[PDB]
């Protein structure tokens, strides 16, 4: 009594009001922007969906007793919304269900009444006009049954409900809604379904069936137009291609669909991370590092989002092969716990010439390296150490006898030194030249001058940028 | 002083890292411990140091006698005198808290000061209490404590009473010197040399001058170094008594490099034995060596390393290896040769320098306007 009766008053008040008014305002705005301003892409619909994704999902995992959030289904289960009294009475029913739940015990679902709270919800003269509301209130029950964090008696229901919602949205878009483009929401739905499939493929077989379904799903897109649809499906599919079945790489290399220019910024980071991974695994290193750094600064601004850790654990190896990382710059407070234990010991061994310590660290942390799915290091990093030494020699000296590098890089012979330096110059790490006569290695000509035709080539790019920005800005000014 | 002696802190450091040096310092460290009956700290140190000697009984009984005498005095005062604020009870518990700081651990003393700070209304007493907190925090290098109370003093109080504040323009810098960061700050605020409390303000004058010289030679080399330190008769007075330091300065200024390295070896050796400076000895030696190398490399454009082999020290291969190490790291702005031993210096023309600066400052700003425009507009 002291823990259940006394803690009952505090809980009931907040979910009774704040969540209900939240979904009320969101539905009102959705109805307003679907009725007027058919170009309703720019609205609070996306902000509402993001807030529901961020805030409402985490506030609860259990079935929300005392009819606070489980009661919404028995509220909207009978909705007509044909004329003014029908919509008014459906809102009144919502209010009355909230009042009853705050006064007495309202309708409860015992892990099996959600289908009647879902079948009857689409029954009782339900309104198609709020198709987005149907989708939202059908997907929200997924996350509770998904984020129940139990994975018992809810994953199967999750899969069935997901299939129901997918079928509903496919039949809805079969009519090709006019001046509405519900896809702006559908995408999230799609992602959500993939979620449970992963959960399904975490509780059962992988997402190959999902793979076929989503090939069909992007095929039904890309035809009319694209509105944030394909931009999600592509990275979902190449996520599954690389999801513990990553051994498949050959194909996606021929995924030649253009990636849409105007996309949600958060997704561009996923796209560039996966492009970097695929580029680096097949041994191209010039483009990989630059595009991955472009990815990192694209959308990192958050309090420890989490995958920045992984991109760092990749950019360190992918640029270890070519030079030096900021040795102490990036080991700060978030990543410090992980990155430091293996990667720091590595780069420290790499700058030094200690092969035995390299083997020691490899033996110690190979399990962690394989767990991260980045075991390329032994494959190439162990046998490409001498490249760094050649780079250093390039930076310091400008005229040296190749008979000296052998004692400087412990090669013990001049001829194989000639071979390795020639290979390095052909690879383009250094542009020196060799006198094949008397053990003479010379640098290229001095830097000619920094103001002949190489500068203005950059200022042209910057003008293109600046004038483009000004035009983009001036166009979309004051719609009404 | 409020703290019994920062000297004792220096001593404990001088005895901690070297076990071999557990002979000379302890000889008077034990005397300083037994005197004043500041017993509470040394027990653990004695667990770390030499084993034990039976004196805890008498030290405990005398500390307890003083404790109870002071407590009875203060309670009788609070029962007979009924004034608050800056009244007699306040100073009685000042005596108690000061005795705790002098003798015991920091927790009880700091709690006493916490319970007495709200009692005051006079700003001078608040400044005195924050000074007590600064001294006790700097005694054990409790970083967050001093970071909080320095801001407390410098913001909440420093708008009324003045000139009793120059006692603090030398403590900001004690902190900025114990941590490697910002030698520039300490150099530019140890600029004043009218020090006040000779030993109540921690270290003695002469040590203060050696510290200002030591830091200053880094933050500014020959951008009017002379008009600040060479023309400073006030420090020329005291360094006239110390030959080593004046030899060091005038060896670097007059371009006499061999004696300069001798002196720097001496300075590095003695800086090893310190408390505030010991962590950064090895950032000093390296950032001085490189300054001298670039100072001589200027005024030449094609030098022969056989010339530095003598005009700067000895050991052709030695300067070879050092030049290699420093050039690779992006410093000692030049290039090298090996077949005929001719170090050639390259230096960007002004125009190239300005072009290189703009090419990055601009695109950095462009990236920020890019992100701004992307967040706005949906």
């Amino acid at each position: 009594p002291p823990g259940g009766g006394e803690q009952e008053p505090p809980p009931p008040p907040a979910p009774q009001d704040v969540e209900m008014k939240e979904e009320a305002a969101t539905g009102g705005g959705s109805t307003g922007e679907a009725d007027g301003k058919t170009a309703a892409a720019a609205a609070e619909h996306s902000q509402r969906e993001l807030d529901t994704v961020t805030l409402e999902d985490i506030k609860e995992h259990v079935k929300q007793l005392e009819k606070a959030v489980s009661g919404k289904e028995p509220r909207f289960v009978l909705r007509a919304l044909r004329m003014l009294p029908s919509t008014s009475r459906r809102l009144n029913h919502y209010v009355l269900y909230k009042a009853v739940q705050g006064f007495f015990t309202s309708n409860n679902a015992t892990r099996d009444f959600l289908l009647p709270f879902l079948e009857e919800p689409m029954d009782t003269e339900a309104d198609l006009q709020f198709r987005p509301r149907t989708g939202k209130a059908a997907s929200t029950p997924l996350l509770p049954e998904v984020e129940a964090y139990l994975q018992l008696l809810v994953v199967i229901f999750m899969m069935n409900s997901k299939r129901y919602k997918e079928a509903q949205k496919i039949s809805d878009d079969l009519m090709q809604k006019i001046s509405t483009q519900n896809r702006r929401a559908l995408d999230l739905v799609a992602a959500k379904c993939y979620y449970y499939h992963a959960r399904v493929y975490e509780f059962l077989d992988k997402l190959d069936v999902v793979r076929s379904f989503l090939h069909a799903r992007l095929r039904t897109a890309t035809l009319r137009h694209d509105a944030d649809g394909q931009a999600t499906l592509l990275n979902l599919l190449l996520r599954n291609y690389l999801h513990y079945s990553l051994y498949d790489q050959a194909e996606k290399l021929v995924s030649k669909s253009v990636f849409p220019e105007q996309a949600n910024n958060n997704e561009w980071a996923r796209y560039l991370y996966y492009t970097g991974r695929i580029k680096a695994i097949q041994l191209e290193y010039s483009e990989a590092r630059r595009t991955m750094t472009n990815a990192l600064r694209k959308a990192p601004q958050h309090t420890a989002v989490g995958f920045k850790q992984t991109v760092h654990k990749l950019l360190i190896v992918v640029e270890l092969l070519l030079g030096e990382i900021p040795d102490r710059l990036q080991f700060r407070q978030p990543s410090l716990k992980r990155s430091l234990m293996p990667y720091f010991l590595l780069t420290q061994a790499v700058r030094t010439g200690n092969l035995a310590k390299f083997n020691q660290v490899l033996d110690q942390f190979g399990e962690k390296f394989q767990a991260d799915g980045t075991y390329t290091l032994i494959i190439r990093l162990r046998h490409n150490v001498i490249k760094t030494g050649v780079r250093m020699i390039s930076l310091s000296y400008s005229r040296i006898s190749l008979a000296d590098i052998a004692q400087k890089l412990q090669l013990d012979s001049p001829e194989d030194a000639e071979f390795i330096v020639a290979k390095a110059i052909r690879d383009g790490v250094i542009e020196a030249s060799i006198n094949h006569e008397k053990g003479y290695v010379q640098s290229k000509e001095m830097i000619d001058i920094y103001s002949t035709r190489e500068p203005q080539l950059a200022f042209h790019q910057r003008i293109s940028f600046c004038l483009d920005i000004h035009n983009m800005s001036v166009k979309a000014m004051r719609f009404p | 002083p409020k703290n019994p002696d920062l000297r004792i802190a220096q001593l404990r450091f001088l005895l901690s890292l070297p076990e071999h040096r557990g002979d000379a310092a302890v000889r008077d460290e034990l005397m300083a411990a037994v005197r004043d009956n500041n017993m509470a700290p040394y027990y653990e140190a004695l667990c770390k140091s030499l084993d034990w000697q039976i004196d805890v009984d008498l030290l405990n009984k005398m500390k307890k006698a003083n404790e109870d005498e002071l407590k009875r005095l203060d309670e009788e005062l609070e029962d007979a005198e009924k004034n608050l604020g800056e009244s007699e009870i306040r100073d009685a518990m000042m005596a108690k808290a000061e005795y705790l700081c002098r003798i015991g651990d920091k927790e009880g003393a700091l709690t006493a000061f916490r319970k007495t700070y709200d009692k005051t209304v006079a700003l001078g007493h608040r400044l005195d209490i924050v000074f007590y907190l600064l001294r006790i925090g700097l005694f054990y290098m409790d970083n967050d404590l001093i970071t909080r109370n320095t801001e407390k003093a410098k913001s909440l109080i420093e708008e009324g009473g003045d000139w009793d504040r120059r006692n603090r323009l030398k403590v900001y810098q004690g902190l900025y010197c114990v941590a490697i960061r910002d030698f520039k700050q300490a150099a530019e605020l140890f600029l004043d040399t009218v020090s006040t409390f000779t030993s109540y303000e921690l270290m003695d004058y002469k040590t203060f001058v050696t510290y200002t010289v030591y830091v200053s030679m880094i933050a500014l080399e020959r951008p009017d170094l002379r008009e600040k330190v060479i023309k400073g008769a006030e420090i020329l007075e005291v360094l006239h008594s110390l030959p080593a330091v004046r030899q060091y300065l005038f060896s670097l200024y007059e371009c006499r490099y061999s004696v300069f390295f001798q002196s720097l070896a001496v300075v590095e050796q003695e800086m090893k034995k310190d408390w505030l400076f010991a962590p950064h000895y090895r950032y000093y030696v390296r950032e001085m060596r490189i300054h001298a190398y670039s100072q001589l490399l200027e005024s030449y454009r094609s030098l022969t390393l056989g010339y530095m082999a003598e005009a700067f020290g000895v050991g052709v291969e030695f300067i070879d290896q050092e030049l290699s190490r420093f050039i690779a790291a992006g410093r000692l702005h030049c290039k090298i040769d090996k077949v005929n031993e001719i170090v050639e210096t390259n230096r960007p023309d002004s125009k190239n320098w300005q072009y290189q600066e703009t090419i990055k400052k601009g695109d950095l700003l462009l990236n920020r306007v890019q992100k701004l425009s992307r967040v706005i507009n949906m």
């Binding site: 910057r462 003008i463 600046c466 800005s473 000014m477 004051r478 | 706005i376 507009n377």
Partner: peptide, 30 residues
């Protein structure tokens, strides 16, 4: 590089003010 730039920053400033004012005038009537 020094005349285009201060021609874009002005345009962003004007856009920010416009969106602020238009949305404010919208919610004021709602």
């Amino acid at each position: 590089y020094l005349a285009s730039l201060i021609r874009s920053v002005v345009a962003l400033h004007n856009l920010i003010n416009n969106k602020i004012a238009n949305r404010d005038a919208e919610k004021k009537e709602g």
